[PDB]
């Protein structure tokens, strides 16, 4: 029949049907219980006043298995509203997800949703495929984690992967801290997350832009709430995402994403870096800031050999690129061959 693609992230869950452009359902990966004895996603968020919210997925890895059933249930029976038993199901996993992890995933899909078949795909490789490349290095950055994944001829080189626990929620938290320091008092995280995604931007030269912000108000942009409130925001516009380059803004001694990309290419065989450097595919919501690719350009060309050809690819729909990768993969004539069927499960890209 028809395959489902479900890309479950730390902050959001993108779900829909293989063959589509894009995910049909996008919703918060949260599971709310009382202080109906469960609630999921957007409904859980609305009723958070009488619920305790947990996030099953931590930094790209599933960590609460009971709650994660609730998410998948909520996906099949409500977001998509379909018999899972009639539909093979593609799921995505993070770069260096433990074998034992993906085994639970797989058991749950068969033993509790009784899917007829399934496959688990690494997310970064899907984003690359969505870009129409077999070889590149991906920077996925979401709500909870950031990876650098060099990929050569369709396969991730696991020893060169880099994980970095700094992503969107952290940027949102930071924006809250500094909007507060500024004089606003930020039920109101959602307002702040909206501002982050409509007003923030990466600056080409940070100190250079700090100086522009001090000298006029040419850089000030406002956000208009429906209650009348206008929150106006200047240099914190570009300071917030500047954290990806300078983790020290939020107290983290980790290095920025332009260094982790460089260090990743350097863990790879010298004979494939030319290709890596010319194929920086950016995946993920946290990579959506205006100006980010020009910064990555600038920053990694200053790290890379003097004569290297460097390209950053920033797909306009990179917010859903993992998902789009899954839809294409799940739709291919060749994919019937490489599912894992329920029958194969009862005998044990």
């Amino acid at each position: 029949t028809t395959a489902l693609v479900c890309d479950n992230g730390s902050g959001l869950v993108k779900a829909g049907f293989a063959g589509d452009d894009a995910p049909r359902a996008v919703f918060p990966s949260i599971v709310g219980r009382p202080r109906k004895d469960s609630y999921v996603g957007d409904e859980a968020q609305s009723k958070r006043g009488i619920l305790t919210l947990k996030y099953p997925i931590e930094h790209g890895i599933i960590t609460n298995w009971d709650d994660m059933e609730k998410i998948w249930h909520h996906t099949f029976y409500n977001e998509l509203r379909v018999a899972p038993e009639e539909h093979p199901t593609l799921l995505t996993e993070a770069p260096l997800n433990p074998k034992a992890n993906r085994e639970k995933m797989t058991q749950i899909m068969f033993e509790t949703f009784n899917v007829p078949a399934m496959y688990v795909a690494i997310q970064a490789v899907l984003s690359l495929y969505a870009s129409g490349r077999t070889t590149g290095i991906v920077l996925d950055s979401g709500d909870g984690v950031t990876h650098n994944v060099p990929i050569y001829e369709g396969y991730a080189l696991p020893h060169a992967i880099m994980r970095l626990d700094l992503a969107g929620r952290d940027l949102t938290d930071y924006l809250m801290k500094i909007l507060t320091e500024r004089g606003y008092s930020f039920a109101e995280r959602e307002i702040v997350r909206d501002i982050k995604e409509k007003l923030c931007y990466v600056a080409l030269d940070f100190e250079n832009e700090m100086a522009t912000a001090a000298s006029s108000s040419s850089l000030e942009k406002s956000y208009e709430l429906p209650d009348g409130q206008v929150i106006t925001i200047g240099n914190e516009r570009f300071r917030c995402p500047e954290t990806l380059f300078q983790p020290s803004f939020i107290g983290m001694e980790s290095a920025g994403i332009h260094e982790t990309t460089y260090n990743s290419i350097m863990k790879c065989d010298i004979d494939i870096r030319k290709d890596l450097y010319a194929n920086n595919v950016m995946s993920g919501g946290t990579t959506m800031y205006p100006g980010i690719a020009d910064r990555m350009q600038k920053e990694i060309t200053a790290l890379a050999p003097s004569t290297m050809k460097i390209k950053i690819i920033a797909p306009p729909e990179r917010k859903y690129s993992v998902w789009i990768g899954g839809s294409i993969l799940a739709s291919l004539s060749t994919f019937q061959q490489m599912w894992i069927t329920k029958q194969e499960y009862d005998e044990a890209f």
Binding site: G132, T134, I328
Partner: protein, 346 residues
Amino acid sequence: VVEHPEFLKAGKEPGLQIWRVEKFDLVPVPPNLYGDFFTGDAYVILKTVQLRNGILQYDLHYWLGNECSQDESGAAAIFTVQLDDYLNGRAVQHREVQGFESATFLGYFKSGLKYKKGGVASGFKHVVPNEVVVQRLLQVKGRRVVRATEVPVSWESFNNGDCFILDLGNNIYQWCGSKSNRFERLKATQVSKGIRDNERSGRAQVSVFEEGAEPEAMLQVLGPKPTLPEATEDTVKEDAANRKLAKLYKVSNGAGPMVVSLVADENPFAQGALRSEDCFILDHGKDGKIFVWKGKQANMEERKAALKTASDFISKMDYPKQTQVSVLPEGGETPLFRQFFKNWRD
């Protein structure tokens, strides 16, 4: 990992092969057209060379026309690595973009490339995530038994003592008559919160008011409010009608042959009636709705049968042509289906 029919053909003797991607499939280009590439498509090309030792040398090139859709160029890419995998990985891979092909790739063609306008259309169905496009009105009436039925979106369906959900997708507007009743009120609320939490997965907002508090958007849709009829009559005869609004059928091949049977003539259907072993049809077709309910353990015959049976009901009972059948997995029931059961429990 993959031995697709055309893979079996791939790379056996020294030559040039060219497939084009077509609606998620790999399809051989006719050899007589090798050199033509539609600019709206993506191709995979395998070049095999007799290496002097005995084994063969493999170069996969995937060419992407300037005007090809994302599914096509992704597929070209995915096929390329599967092609390469089928050859035990012993092929190097080459992204080729229109108008910047490698000297190597152009060399495969003696007479020059010839680009051709057009291509096979994308295999992608277009969606916009989370988007609902809904405009509809529900009359809610009753007392001992209150049900919600669909009516035309106008003031011509309003009355002083029924409730109404003007469902506009992202926003649900609930409306209550001045001369309405308490039980109509409660049930209208259950349904509105249902449409929001269940049908819309939490991504809508209900608003409750009465005759005279008419919000901004209620009027943008319906125009100005005219004067108001006091309904047909009374709740007792409205309950005797709500009670006979639908019929619930079972569909089961459980003893051998398929058997569509009437379970229930009258209302509150018992939830227990719906059993996981079989399928059910709740026919409410005079409104414009027939539900097929699918037990988690129903077999594919019963599922197929229930769906056909129900679509049969449309051409048979002179229902609106634009009546459609809505199919629900056990576990994924909608408010308008759920209303017909006594105190529904999940």
